[PDB]
Design a protein around this ligand. Structure first.
Ligand SMILES: OC[C@H]1O[C@H](O[C@H]2[C@H](O)[C@@H](O)[C@@H](O[C@H]3[C@H](O)[C@@H](O)[C@@H](O[C@H]4[C@H](O)[C@@H](O)[C@@H](O)O[C@@H]4CO)O[C@@H]3CO)O[C@@H]2CO)[C@H](O)[C@@H](O)[C@@H]1O
Ligand code: CL
Ligand code: CL
Ligand code: CL
Ligand code: K
Ligand code: K
Ligand code: K
Length: 428
């Protein structure tokens, strides 16, 4: 039953870059609330000012380690500062700084766990996340000999010089001049996981190295935040109103929310799909809201289409999640033309709010979006996307309502509690 878990993560609310902080906080809270004792080690990144607990030696120098302790029942959070762990640049500063920071975090973690073990038993498992925490995971397994579980949220696919493993005290893990840290993490782990069954398959070229000890464990979504109980009026009124607030009268509405970049989130695919459609007769019963920022080229292309058409709105400012929740709760479709997707949180947030997804058939999107709950399409293919948008527009029959309902039912089976229960089996 009850386990004591040591969870190593490189970000953790309130200190976040993208969604990882929130996902790790969610997991920890879920584990805790099932009754398990959960200790979290994570860097301070400059936000906390902890107690000195002793020195470590990193790259020929001494570093005084600091620790801030937050405790809430079975959930125990240790934020470790000292040297590079004080940089506010979570994934820095610079590439070299980052990796030195990750080594620093590895030695600092060992120090802390020794310090703690003076007064409590060893944890039953160490669960570390992403490549940044591999020095720490590998050192803890090595020194304290406890079962390790390695979870990959996103494969960085990059190598480090052996120098770093040597300096970390992990020479035995460095039999070549250059070493893939993700591969090392899978290698020393008793169990490896990633956050979706379709990403595990999309990356089987990597993950097959761990046949026999590899599985997937989905992430969750917070549907207590993402639901419609926060919105008023009916969906028609809201849409009628939003569109109008954008200069447009009613029409079936598609939304994209994403950074603007090449070969990732796929706004370029969508901007092209739109051009492809901007000559059909039905392009006129369609409204597009494009939200994000990044590549200037991609920005201009979007601003230009906005100008060319009184049918396209573009938002490069930053939207609060309260407001995004409003958008999802009022548009007809959300479009998710990713080139790859470890999990698919946006699809879930949208689905929790009755928006019907049209997504690339990549990674977790293939898991999440089943055939009664959204439309899937080849990634990278503007004509396939433009076509799907067309199908959707013809879909417009008040049995979009069947879809919407299926979307909600579905998205909500992705609870964090189920993730946690799943990780617990894996721990055991
Ligand atoms: O099981 C032992 C190790 O397993 C894992 O190692 C991985 C590496 O992380 C991968 O990067 C790769 O190793 C490559 C290596 O990256 C590359 O430099 C090259 O190595 C040559 C080397 O240049 C040359 O000097 C000579 O000694 O031969 C080497 C091998 O021919 O190619 C390597 C071979 O793939 O693959 C291994 C496979 O495991 C894990 O990362 C380690 O921590 C673990 O100890
Ligand atoms: Cl992200
Ligand atoms: Cl040390
Ligand atoms: Cl195979
Ligand atoms: K010194
Ligand atoms: K299976
Ligand atoms: K994701």
């Amino acid at each position: 039953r009850h386990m004591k878990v040591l969870l190593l993560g490189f970000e953790f609310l309130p200190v976040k870059v993208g969604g990882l902080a929130e996902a790790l906080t969610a997991i920890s809270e879920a584990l805790a609330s099932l009754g398990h004792e959960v200790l979290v080690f994570t860097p301070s990144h400059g936000r906390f000012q902890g107690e000195e607990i002793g020195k470590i030696r990193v790259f020929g120098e001494e570093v005084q380690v600091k620790v801030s302790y937050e405790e809430r029942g079975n959930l125990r959070i240790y934020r470790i500062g000292g040297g590079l762990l004080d940089s506010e640049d979570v994934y820095g500063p610079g590439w070299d700084g980052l990796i030195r920071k990750a080594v620093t975090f590895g030695r600092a973690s060992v120090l802390l766990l020794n310090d703690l073990l003076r007064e409590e038993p060893l944890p039953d498992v160490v669960h570390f996340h992403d490549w940044h925490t591999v020095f720490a995971g590998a050192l803890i397994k090595k020194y304290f000999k406890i079962p390790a579980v390695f979870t990959i949220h996103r494969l960085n696919k990059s190598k480090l010089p052996a120098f770093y493993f040597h300096e970390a005290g992990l020479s035995e893990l460095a039999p070549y001049p250059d070493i893939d840290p993700e591969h090392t993490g899978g290698y020393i782990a008793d169990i490896v996981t990633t956050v979706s069954r379709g990403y595990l398959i999309d990356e089987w070229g990597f993950f097959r190295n761990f046949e026999g000890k590899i599985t997937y464990v989905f992430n969750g979504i917070d549907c207590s935040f993402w639901n419609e109980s926060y919105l008023t009026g009916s969906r028609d009124e809201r849409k009628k109103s939003l569109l109008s607030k954008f200069g447009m009268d009613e029409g079936v509405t598609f939304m994209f929310i994403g950074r603007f970049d090449r070969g990732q989130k796929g706004v370029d695919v969508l901007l092209k799909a739109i051009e492809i459609l901007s000559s059909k007769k039905e392009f006129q019963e369609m409204r597009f809201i494009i939200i994000g920022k990044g590549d200037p080229e991609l920005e201009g292309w979007a601003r230009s289409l906005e100008e060319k058409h009184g049918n396209v709105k573009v938002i490069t400012e930053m939207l609060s999640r309260e407001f995004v929740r409003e958008l999802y709760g009022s548009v007809d479709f959300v479009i998710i033309p990713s080139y790859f997707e470890p999990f698919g949180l946006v699809a879930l947030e949208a689905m929790c709010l009755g928006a019907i997804p049209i997504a690339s058939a990549v990674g977790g999107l293939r898991d999440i979006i089943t055939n009664e709950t959204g439309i899937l399409v080849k990634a990278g293919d503007p004509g396939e996307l433009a076509n799907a948008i067309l199908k959707a527009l013809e879909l417009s029959r008040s049995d979009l309502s069947k879809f919407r309902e299926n979307c909600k039912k579905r998205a909500m089976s992705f609870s964090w509690e189920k993730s946690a229960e799943r990780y617990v089996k894996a721990y055991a």
